[PDB]
Amino acid sequence: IANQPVVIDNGSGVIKAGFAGDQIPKYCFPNYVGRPKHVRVMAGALEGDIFIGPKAEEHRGLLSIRYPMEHGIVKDWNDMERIWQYVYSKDQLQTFSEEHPVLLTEAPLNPRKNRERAAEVFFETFNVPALFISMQAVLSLYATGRTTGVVLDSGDGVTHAVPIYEGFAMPHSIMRIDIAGRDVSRFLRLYLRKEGYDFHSSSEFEIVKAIKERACYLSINPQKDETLETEKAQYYLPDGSTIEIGPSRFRAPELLFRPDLIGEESEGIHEVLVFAIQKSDMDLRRTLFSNIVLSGGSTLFKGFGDRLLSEVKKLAPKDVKIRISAPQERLYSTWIGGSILASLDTFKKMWVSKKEYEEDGARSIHRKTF
C-alpha cells in the first residue's frame, strides 16, 4: 500500500533520512557500526554489541568503528543491513519495514552488483511495498529549485559531476572520481603523524574528521600561502590536549583539487567539473557554465568556492560567465530533493513494485534505473 514514503540517503560517512513530505532530515547520524573492543566485567554496562547511531559519538572511546560503505560501494553488507534496521529502529523512525515506499539514493556509476544486492536487502530482509533508486544529482536540483545545471557534489567518499540540462540528464558526460572527505581526512591524519600526534585508532580517526570539518580551509594560491607561515590553529582534543596544525590546515584539502599529492593519477575536482561540461554538446556549454550547483558535505570547506571560481575560470573559455550557486543546505540537498520527488504522484508512477521485483529481480531495477 502507499503510506508516507521514506527517503534514505546512503551518504558514505553520514546517512541522512526521514519521511517524505518533510522539510528537513531529522535523522542524521554517521554511517558505521561500532563494536566494543574492550573487556566487560561490571554488570550493568552499556547495552548491545553494535553501536550505530548517536550512542557511538557518545561513547566513542570504547568502540572500534568500521565503515560499511567505501567509495559509495558497500563492502560489509551485514553492517548496512544493521544500519538500515537502525534507521527503522525505535530511536529513529519507529515504522515497520512493510509500511513505506523507500527512496534510496546512490552515487552515480556504482557497480551493478550494488543495486542488485540493495534490492535483495530491501525486498527480502525488509519487505518494503515499493523501492526506487536514483541519482543524487537530480535530487539536489529538486532541492535547489531548478531544472538545468551541473551538480558537482562531494560526499564523504565520492565526488562527481552530473550535468543535467532541462531535466534531461546526459549520461556520457558524467565524471566520477573516488576522492572526497575521507581522503581529505586520511591525508590530514598522515600529516598529523608527521607533526607528531600519531592518530591511528578508529576514534582518533573521527577526531581527525572533526578537525577537517573545523580547522582546515582552502587555499587561493598555494604557493603564495606556502611561502608564508600561517595561523597555526590550536585545536583542543576532548581529552584536553592541544594540537597545532600549521600549513597543513590548507595543505590537507588540496587533495581534492590535486590527487597527485596522495600519489594518484586522476583529475582534480575542477577538472571533473570542466570535463563534465565539455563532454556534453556545444550549445549547452555556456548554460552549464552559468549554472553550477554544489552539494555534498565536502564542499563546505571555508574558502572553497572562491578557489573553484579561480580554477574553472582559469580553465573555461574567455569571459564565459561561470556562476556557482552554493546554498546553505548543501548537506541535505540530496535528502530534501528525495523528499520533494517522493512527495509526488509521479513517484507512485516511478518506483518499482514489490510484486514486479519478485517476478523479475535485478532486471527490473536496471530497467527502471532512470
Binding site: 561561470i322 556562476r323 556557482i324 552554493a326
Partner: peptide, 24 residues
C-alpha cells in the same frame, strides 16, 4: 533562520553565489 540552525553543519555567513565579474 531556525530551520538552518537546528541542523549540525550549515554554511553560516558565506556568500551563496559565486560568479565572475562583469566587463566581458
Amino acid at each position: 533562520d531556525p530551520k538552518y540552525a537546528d541542523l549540525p553543519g550549515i554554511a553560516r555567513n558565506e556568500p551563496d553565489v559565486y560568479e565572475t565579474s562583469d566587463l566581458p
